[PDB]
Symmetry: D3
Subunit: 131 residues, 6 copies
Amino acid sequence: GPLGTPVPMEKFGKILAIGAYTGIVEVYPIAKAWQEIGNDVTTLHVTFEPMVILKEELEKAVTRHIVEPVPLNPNQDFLANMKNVSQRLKEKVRELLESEDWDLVFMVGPVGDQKQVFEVVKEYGVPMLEH
Amino acid sequence: GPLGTPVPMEKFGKILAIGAYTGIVEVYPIAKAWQEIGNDVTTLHVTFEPMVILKEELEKAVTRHIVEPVPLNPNQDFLANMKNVSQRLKEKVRELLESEDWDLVFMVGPVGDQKQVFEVVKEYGVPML
Amino acid sequence: GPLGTPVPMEKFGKILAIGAYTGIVEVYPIAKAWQEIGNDVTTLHVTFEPMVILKEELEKAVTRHIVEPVPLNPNQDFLANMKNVSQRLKEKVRELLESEDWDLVFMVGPVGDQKQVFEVVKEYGVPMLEH
Amino acid sequence: GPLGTPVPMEKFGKILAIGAYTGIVEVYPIAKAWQEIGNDVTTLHVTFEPMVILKEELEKAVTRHIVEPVPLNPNQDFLANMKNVSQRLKEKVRELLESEDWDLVFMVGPVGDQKQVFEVVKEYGVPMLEH
Amino acid sequence: GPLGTPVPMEKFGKILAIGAYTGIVEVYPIAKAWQEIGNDVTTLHVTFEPMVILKEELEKAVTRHIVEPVPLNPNQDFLANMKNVSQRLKEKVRELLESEDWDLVFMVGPVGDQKQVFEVVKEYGVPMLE
Amino acid sequence: GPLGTPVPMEKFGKILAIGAYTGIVEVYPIAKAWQEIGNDVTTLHVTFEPMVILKEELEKAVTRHIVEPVPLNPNQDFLANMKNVSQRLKEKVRELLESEDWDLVFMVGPVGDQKQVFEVVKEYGVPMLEH
């Protein structure tokens, strides 16, 4: 049967675990285990205002948990709205990589955002892992 | 970099391509290509009312496209709401497998729904991608 | 059981889908789907004169379908004959990459031709997909 | 770049290494190494009369090498001819599994024959591999 | 570069994480994380007396850590000695599966022991991860 | 069921097949088959004095077999002792790559040594394969 994304349990150092939309449900148990193993993981959840979940849970499991709630405008096709989440996603990552330094970046979310986020990462020389 | 789920381009016959939440964006190009290759693909999109997308696009690409919009109750933690989508998902699949017969089922969505949907599928003897 | 080569359904742009010998049977459904998805795929079938297949089918499915029928000389061990197909294969690819520009090259055929064809591709900086 | 099918080097016992068409070129070095490692490998090459290759080489490398040359009828589309090879392939395998007993079956050839051959194998409870 | 065995982080329930010889070094961080995620993992380290490691560390990370130190007889080729570890490995597993019930078994060690241990597991209907 | 590391059977040329601790048991059948296929494989077994195995067997199967027995100091936690094997491992590899030239390096041993050995290999531009 289907299982969570198989990931290696090592000390990579400082990890940026990203979860887009409901993708955060899956990164939760992963980020929790990396922190316990000795990794400084900071999670980022980018989704719509009415969809944040596990906020309380992973602020207590990682060194730092970031939530970027994008407003769900119901006057536009959903595509127009995802475009906003995609934007907020590049901006925050670009901002976190241009800010502090990371040892690894891991993400789980639509393959269209994984691509856009990969572009920002290959930009800074930080290794990545995609679901 | 990251790419769409690599899938085989064959004639499996009748395919049920499922997309949960934004997972439908990815199944779209896949189901479109399977139809053109000679597969009778019917897509199912289970998500919240304010999140259906590509509806028009894949009704024109597949033999049949089904959308099950679950009401987003803003008076409950999001977990309580996903539970409704998970329910609507088992019910519709159970209903489609208990109804017509399929050659293959393929799904893209949270791993928690993929599990629940896999239980319904292993139940009927239909292979899952 | 065994299934067709699992491939990603994206818009890479202009694709050169190659099929050596009976390998064309498998690339057919793949190239057909890539065209429909928005890719400018041109297929190349290199085989012996008495073995071309699906010619009609994939000329209608891709922007352009090329067939290079090599004469099957029955006065030589089959090895000596495959050598001619291997030659015709490097030449046509070298010619198509030195000619137009491609975004991706995908091939299905004996692993000995996949190697020789890979050498020509790494030569032009075009990404590839093997087995 | 592309390499031969990665395979495990163990003693499975009696192995039936199958190579359809030019697929035999690849199974050759594989079957040769399995024999040397202590496996009783018998290879089967199913192809058209004008395409047998490596016959001498692998009769010397395996316990037994079988060649089934199917006549290439030039008065029919190649599809009609492959159908004959597909048939000869099911028949000989069915015949070899219904005859002696095997510990493993490994095959390299078009994915359409790998399927048909897999059906015959799942029939006898013998474990299998592909290309 | 090479990394640890990629594994899924889920609640399978009760997990038997096995580490043969130095294989225990790798299962350590894995079993530690599974316990934290809500799994009742009990680790088993089968090796020679002069090779046990991380004993203290994983008794504190898992519900239960088992160590089976096999005596290293220096009067026999190493092959003859590994045979003893392979034996102690089948026996303890057979004993733990015939005893309590498990939801999953995961192992890291030579491929020759993974096979022998797999035979014992397929015997009881317990799923395995290599 | 679990099987040996699936590996490709080709002529890479000169191969350095490394086996740490009991990892040598698995590389044995692999290195034996590579030699027979036309590869100049030299195996290296790094382990503790009381753990060398297959020495006789693979000196007869490869062009050259190297054994580096590290003394097992029983007055230190096993971790302190593995550190010595890890050291002897980098040194001998560094020494073999700085000495002769290789076409490929393949290793099977703890993932902590595979990493340390990979650093030495990426240093000389020699391609590698892990377990």
